[PDB]
Amino acid sequence: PYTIELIQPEDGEAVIAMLKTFFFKAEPLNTFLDLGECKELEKYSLKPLPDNCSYKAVNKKGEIIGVFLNGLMRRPSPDDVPEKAADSCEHPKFKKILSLMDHVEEQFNIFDVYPDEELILDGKILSVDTNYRGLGIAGRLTERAYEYMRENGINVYHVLCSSHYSARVMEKLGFHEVFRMQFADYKPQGEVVFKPAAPHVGIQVMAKEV
């Protein structure tokens, strides 16, 4: 009912179009901030593409019905300082989400968990057309990243989940929770910033060792 293919640089507009249909509106932190369509969000979402390890599921008409956008994560050199993506972001609501993401990388370093790993695959966005859900697509997209990981000597697939539905999908594929931060505990300036709808109670960083 679908094929699994690598996402080509020519695919960015089709990727964005597919995430505008299914994903951006439904992200719980987006829904909580009433963040709508947003240009910063769209470009941040397309950032991993040049890493050439993102994958798409396409139907018989050649339309993208699912994606799993991945970026490469290189173990930092000792000279390297962490980048704060919330800085240099200008949208008021989206900077709140990028701040949270910075806060998570400040509180949990995946590269300390796996000291023998120089390179780690980073699952950024997984989205499937509702008309094509329940057909094993997320598993096939994830199996396709396993092939990439094997060709490039990667052993750890790291997936930060802002949605409990995404974390449950990865849990079912054999990922395990390596870190959790509750939204009730994220009070960077003394006060709670996110209180999304249950069951999205916090951030789950999921990982698999292949």
Tell whether 77 is in a known binding site. Answer: no
The phi and psi torsions of 79 (rounded to 5 degrees) equal -65, -35
134 is in an annotated binding site: yes
Cα dihedral sign, 203-33-81-48? positive
126 a known binding residue?
A: yes
**CA-to-CA distance for 178 and 167, rounded, in angstroms?**
11
Give the angle subtended at the CA of 149 by the CAs of 143 and 151, to the nearest 5°.
110
**C-alpha–C-alpha distance, residues 33 and 160, integer Å:** 19
Nearest CA-CA partner of 51 in 6, 110, 101, 118: 6
Element (H, E) at 126: strand 119-128
Q: Is 100 marked as binding a ligand?
A: no
Q: What is the C-alpha separation between 112 and 10, in angstroms, rounded?
A: 36
Please, which residues bridge with residue 205 across strands?
160, 179
Euclidean distance between CA atoms 41 and 191, whole angstroms: 24
* Residue 23 neighbours by CB distance under 10 Å: 18
Please name the residue ranges forming H helices in the chain.
Answer: 12-22, 28-33, 39-46, 92-107, 110-113, 137-151, 164-172
Q: Which residues pair with 161 in a beta bridge?
A: 204
Q: Give the CA-trace dihedral at 209, 141, 48, 34, to 10 degrees.
A: -110
CATH classification for the domain delimited by 3-209, as one of 3.40.980.10, 3.40.630.30, 1.10.40.30, 3.30.70.20: 3.40.630.30
Sorted by where each begins, the domain ranges of the chain are 3-209
137 assigned ligand-binding residue: yes
Burial 164-188 (b: 16+ CB within 10 A, else e): bebbebbeebebeebbebebeebee
- Look up residue 117 and give its amino acid: E
Residue 128 assigned as binding residue = yes
Q: Which residue has the tokens 């470009």?
A: 43
